[PDB]
Amino acid sequence: AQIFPRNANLLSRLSIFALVLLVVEGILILGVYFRSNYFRQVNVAIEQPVAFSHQLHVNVVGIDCRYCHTSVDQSYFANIPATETCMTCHSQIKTYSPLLEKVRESYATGKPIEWVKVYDLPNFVYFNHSIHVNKGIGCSTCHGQVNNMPVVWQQQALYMGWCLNCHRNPELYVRPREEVYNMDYVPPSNQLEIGRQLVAEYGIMPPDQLTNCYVCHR
């Protein structure tokens, strides 16, 4: 009552309460940003220079994935199709069309097509497509339903815990060697029983080794 109004006793306690809420809200905003779909570029349809539609070439035309990414079951790298594979069809199909101008400008000149990488890794990760495909893991569980994407987007962010989830518990995501095709295939109702049997048959190593640092980082 000397130097303070009557309401200050309520305000001071309310201010402390408001301060705590603001602090909690701050940490919340921070975590939401580092896990958002804009920061990780998840569900964002990255625009390509030639506007290639996987939905037209897989679900309509009916091209196999290995016709284009021919190095997926043999090396760590899934091959990105050269202009020769595109000209094999577009030398007669839709020739003299504006949408294929960039593809026709290449192959005549040695310049490549500068596609944008959708699935990106920080170069200290070292992923291997061959070992995953040969051990009964399909593209549906990783890249999603790519066969129906007019523009390819990142289905989910490539966190470390996302790899650790399958490596520690592979019984939930393993499939019986129908990975290249059967994008329509989905986990059966009895996935745990089939998964444990597949892990034993394919010799998928226990989580003790698969969680080691040098399996990924080098």
Binding site: Q41, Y107, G110, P112, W115, V116, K117, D120, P122
Partner: peptide, 12 residues
Amino acid sequence: QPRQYIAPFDRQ
């Protein structure tokens, strides 16, 4: 991360 372009071949 930035865009990180990728430039494949024209003839394999």
